[PDB]
Design a protein around this ligand. Structure first.
Ligand code: GDP
Ligand code: MG
Ligand code: MG
Ligand code: MG
Length: 179
């Protein structure tokens, strides 16, 4: 009857995974109370005229539990693989940590590469703090290149803070899961 797809979100601690789920889940109508933990959390989305049940799994809190975390991977239909645009170190962990893991436990599962916190790219305090480490915010082309490099289905940027791009992240994930 209903189409259910399992979505798992991964990426470094504090890169915006939980906030991204919260903003998406709060967008749903009728309005529902949204918790701060997501484990098989069912969200109903309509994409291209089709009703889909997305079962959301957040790995926040598990980023350094290398043996516990992969227990969430079986029968995943789509991966949101996140980094934060205010953290080049988070982007470097995409090929170095997250991609090998996800490809191992989720073979042939489509990956959406997601750059979070896009509102920080041109933020004065963010630039100043990063410059102390000889870094700067991630550029869009660096995100697009990484997405090609890891064989992502697509690349999206979003901000949980402004909500820009959030809907589109989940529409893209849903299409990927269906196809
Ligand atoms: N400026 C900005 N801050 C964000 C955004 N998303 C999350 N944050 C903040 O970044 C921190 C980590 O976010 P969280 O979603 O808990 O990250 P998680 O550990 O990956 O689940 C929190 O202080 C959030 O309020 C965003 O889009 N823009
Ligand atoms: Mg990351
Ligand atoms: Mg976010
Ligand atoms: Mg839940």
């Amino acid at each position: 009857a209903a189409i259910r797809k399992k979505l798992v979100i991964v990426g470094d601690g504090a890169c915006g995974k939980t906030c991204l789920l919260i903003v998406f889940s709060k967008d749903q109508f009728p309005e529902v109370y949204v918790p701060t933990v997501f484990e098989n959390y069912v969200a109903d989305i309509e994409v291209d005229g089709k009703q889909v049940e997305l079962a959301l799994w957040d790995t926040a809190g598990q980023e350094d539990y290398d043996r516990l975390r992969p227990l969430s991977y079986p029968d995943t239909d789509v991966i949101l693989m996140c980094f934060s645009i205010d953290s080049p170190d988070s982007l470097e962990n995409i090929p170095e940590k997250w991609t090998p893991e996800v490809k191992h436990f989720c073979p042939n599962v489509p990956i959406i590469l997601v750059g979070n916190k896009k509102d920080l790219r041109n933020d004065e305090h963010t630039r100043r703090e990063l410059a102390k480490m000889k870094q700067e915010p991630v550029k869009p082309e660096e995100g697009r290149d990484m997405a090609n490099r890891i064989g992502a289905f697509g690349y999206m940027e979003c901000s949980a803070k402004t909500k820009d791009g959030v809907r589109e992240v989940f529409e893209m994930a849903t299409r990927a899961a269906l196809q």
